[PDB]
Write a protein that binds this ligand. Structure first.
Ligand code: HEM
Ligand code: HEM
Ligand code: HEM
Ligand code: HEM
Ligand code: HEM
Lengths: 238, 238, 238, 238, 238
């Protein structure tokens, strides 16, 4: 059950790591490539004790990116060790590291102050399907947002949540608190089988006032398809 | 007829994919290059069932770009599969992927609220010629735009449309709704045999108020000439 | 006389194309380099029917640039074909394409509304010398500029023109209308034997109000020396 | 004891130097790599008279960076000579230099003007552990900050200090005065065993008014693990 | 004495050229590298008639840069010819050219309008030492600055000069007028034996009003050590 503990509980660090495959990877024979896929596969299993790693095919959906990992760990030391080991494998040595972002999952700041009916809706179980699309949008808030007192922010966030409620059924959302660990305040992560819903979700949110306090939004916006690592890697060994 | 259903109907995803050819492609003999063009040509025909692909020569018109595809598909899964297959062909292995943008085609938001005579003019058949120039300008709206109510935006869009009406006859326009799928809100796409008209069209639009709510406009602005894939690729195999 | 028709008449497209030579070019023997200069020389002659090409030594004057062409053509199709052919020559295959900008030459928008004495001074023949320095500054206007009515813009332009009049004799100026063909509204081009004069010219213009409506100015500012192609290329074949 | 004099005394220059390992490093045999690690190790020891160098593993924590040095020296001349020597070693020749920033340590400008109890708290010994995480955030103040008089700035800094006091015990902080030696005003450096606390510390500080006078903040924000040089380099010679 | 005429007189153009050494330079044997240093050394002496060149070790002090020349010439033609010949030497062919900026030295615009005591202090001889640190900060003024009349700017500059007077003794300053020749208005250049003083100088200047009319400041800020060309190049041939 500890797999779920990393995915839901607070205190857990989440890292998003992007990679792009070099040209000269394909100058390697398909034999050696398949051997290299085995190494990576094996390294991940070795770390299955200390961290949970999920993989996404970004190739053909996000610019300048083929692969993303989402890594859950209780210390970033562990995530560092893993990612460094990964980048050291034969396969990793032909990758170019793109972006890298960290944030901790936390007990919610505002939700207690929302009405009880809104709390009930937030508990009712949302999207949960196999091989969803996944989106990742990093966000930095403006100075104005921190200047507001708690009551003001709580009210703006209630408005946010209200706009989003109709999309709970078809879009799963997870929030990571990132300030100080890199150049952004939050990493937002989403899963959905229907991208048009996620698009409508973001359009709904562009109406709420809070959404203009986002000094940075995307850059990049990462789009991909969530899949087992073997499947993604096996595609590269052809 | 399903080819036109992808080009006109709502719900269809449109992807714009840019590529640049490596120096070392030309270090390959003209024989192997012509072989490689056959592979790509064949791959596209294999996907002719599930997607429609159109090609544009950007070399010599847009900076740092040789080729662009506009890809229509009902799911971005299919577009992903295609693009990844493409990038894997021998030809694709010597390409560097530039930008990548997605947006869904939608039933119009404001046009119902326009006067009847304007609706008639929008129906009257515009530009439709062979081997036109094509332009692509990605756009992100400012926060102020979303703060406006529906009535205010409808009025601003009627003004936009009015400015553009005289150009219907010589410029074809298509709009893709992109928010959430990448870093922009819209992808605008245009065809014309006379670039002067398109330039005059944009100047006319720079007068309307709405046009200042474009927090981002171009970067890149892509200019090319639309042509059959064999013609473009054949040029690279010389 | 048609050479002058391309340089002065309206409707003519002007393209500015920058290039930088790769390190590995020099790894080629001086024999092959001279052969390659012949090929380029020959290609230009073959296009002398449909376009006019002029060349500028940017090496040592503009950062990250060795060569610039200014190409006049009546369609960008023809400019595309040429530049693509050029980039295909053995010499072109060792070049890295820098920036690329287009604009059409047009009948003047404001000059009719100026006083008659100012019209006469604008007619009086300015600088025209061999092997001048050449400068190219791209410009994008701010939203405020388009919000102004014609009367306001004509008055601001009369002020611009007034500031510039004393420099007509030692600086030649040409303006290209670029909006919609790339990320800028204008391409400005100048020739002078005395760079201090051009520097004073720009200083004089930084006083006029209109000059603060330039949301983008330069980036890059291109400086070079105008010369026959054979002389530039010959220098690289040593 | 002079090691501590460099780390705490005023007048001492501090340099932060980032590096990333090239792909072709791994194309060298493990033999030669181990040789190369010996050379660097030896160079550092030769400079142990004139400078103190500390090392941080950025690989897997900061994007596009594997290694950082923090170098203390009494002249930047010495730091120059060392870094240039380092970049010349065989290992250094397969590195790509990322960012580089300098600042001098100074006697505090505002702390004398704080209340006595706050001064006592600042003296009380904070975090001091082995192999901490390290963070580095470069900062540039806005024009408004310098326009304030000394009294206004003292008051805003007292507020900053207050917000940060609870974190003294679990976060060590060091400030370098950087204006004029590069494009920023300050380099901030931190050590902590608990990244959660650092994150909370930055959140607490986002409430104070002074924190909005930071025209630039991060870009990059550097995150790593502090460790002996032999251990980091050893990792690369596998 | 004409060496000093280029360094002090008006009308003289000054060019700042930055370079970085390729990895593959060190793949050349130490024999060939020392031969290459001879070539460059000789080329400089051949141009000793027409231009004065001074060299600076940027490696280890400025990011992404190893070498800088400051070149004084009466025409930029001569600077262009030199730099191009330089970049063509075997040594220059393994260099990557970084930034490049030009500006003319001019008779002062405001100093006549200052009080007489301030004029006397400006005459009293400042810093002049061997092998100083050198700093170069490019500056672009904001639109507001040019909107001001001459009296306003003279007053703002007197305030600048007053803030700076105490540093005349330990910092030498030189100003180049750059508008129109590249993307900035001024190139500022400084020599000092004590970097702490220069830092304090810039801090003192950050309090004057004029200093917030700098729309761009640095990017880059170049820091190095001034030395004979032999010594710098010799270091690279080891
Ligand atoms: C799927 C529907 C969504 C729901 C139900 C939802 C709900 C919430 C809730 C309840 C919070 C408050 C967390 C707390 O109390 O600590 C929150 C925060 C946040 N949400 Fe969403 N959200 C949704 C979609 C989105 C989207 C699409 C984005 C942006 C792409 C987004 C961006 C954020 C950000 C940046 C915060 C943190 C703001 C802050 O605490 O200062 N959310 N969301
Ligand atoms: C060729 C003639 C043109 C016509 C007839 C036209 C017409 C329209 C119409 C009717 C809409 C509203 C669609 C809806 O109801 O959702 C629209 C939207 C839009 N148009 Fe155009 N347009 C033209 C050219 C352009 C050009 C040149 C651009 C920009 C390069 C442009 C940019 C946009 C954008 C960004 C929107 C989305 C507005 C929004 O919903 O915020 N149009 N256009
Ligand atoms: C020889 C000195 C110059 C003269 C005589 C001159 C004259 C003019 C005139 C008459 C126009 C308006 C043309 C029309 O009515 O369509 C114009 C437009 C323009 N000029 Fe100049 N100019 C000079 C130098 C410059 C310089 C140095 C720059 C900037 C580097 C510049 C930037 C522009 C721009 C961007 C426009 C287009 C403005 C608009 O139409 O919205 N000019 N110039
Ligand atoms: C417990 C941790 C911290 C403490 C105890 C602390 C305390 C202080 C104190 C006392 C000063 C004044 C130095 C003087 O008077 O000359 C100062 C300056 C400064 N601190 Fe902190 N701070 C802490 C954390 C941070 C953090 C997390 C940041 C930013 C990420 C930061 C940014 C700065 C900056 C930029 C200055 C210079 C302000 C100026 O002189 O304009 N500090 N800090
Ligand atoms: C020894 C210290 C300095 C002294 C004595 C000094 C003095 C002066 C003087 C007298 C002028 C006006 C000359 C004229 O009439 O054109 C001037 C201009 C200027 N100085 Fe300084 N300066 C010093 C340091 C600096 C520094 C550190 C910077 C920036 C890093 C700087 C930036 C400028 C700029 C951009 C101008 C041109 C202002 C304009 O004409 O718009 N100066 N300086």
């Amino acid at each position: 059950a500890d797999r779920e503990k990393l995915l839901t509980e607070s205190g857990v660090y989440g890292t998003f790591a992007t990679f792009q495959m070099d040209h000269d990877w394909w100058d390697l024979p398909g034999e050696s490539r398949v051997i290299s896929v085995a190494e990576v596969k094996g390294l991940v299993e070795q770390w299955s004790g200390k961290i949970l790693v999920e993989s996404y095919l970004l190739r053909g959906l996000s610019d300048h990116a083929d692969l993303m990992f989402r890594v859950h760990a209780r210390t970033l030391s562990d995530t560092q060790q893993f990612l460094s080991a990964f980048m050291g494998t034969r396969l990793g040595r032909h990758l170019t590291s793109g972006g890298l972002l960290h944030g901790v999952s936390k007990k919610p700041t505002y939700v207690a102050g929302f009405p009880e009916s809104m709390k009930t809706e937030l508990q009712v179980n949302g999207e949960s399907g196999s091989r969803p699309y996944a989106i990742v949008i990093p966000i930095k808030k403006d100075a104005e947002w921190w200047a507001l007192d708690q009551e003001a922010r709580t009210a703006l966030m209630q408005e946010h949540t209200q706009a989003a409620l109709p999309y709970l059924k078809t879009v799963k959302a997870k929030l990571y608190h990132s300030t100080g660990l890199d150049d952004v305040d939050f990493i937002t992560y989403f899963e959905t089988e229907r991208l048009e819903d996620f698009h409508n979700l973001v359009r709904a949110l562009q109406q709420v006032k809070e959404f203009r306090h986002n000094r940075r939004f995307g850059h990049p916006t990462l789009l991909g398809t969530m899949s087992p690592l073997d499947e993604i890697l096996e595609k590269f060994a052809q």
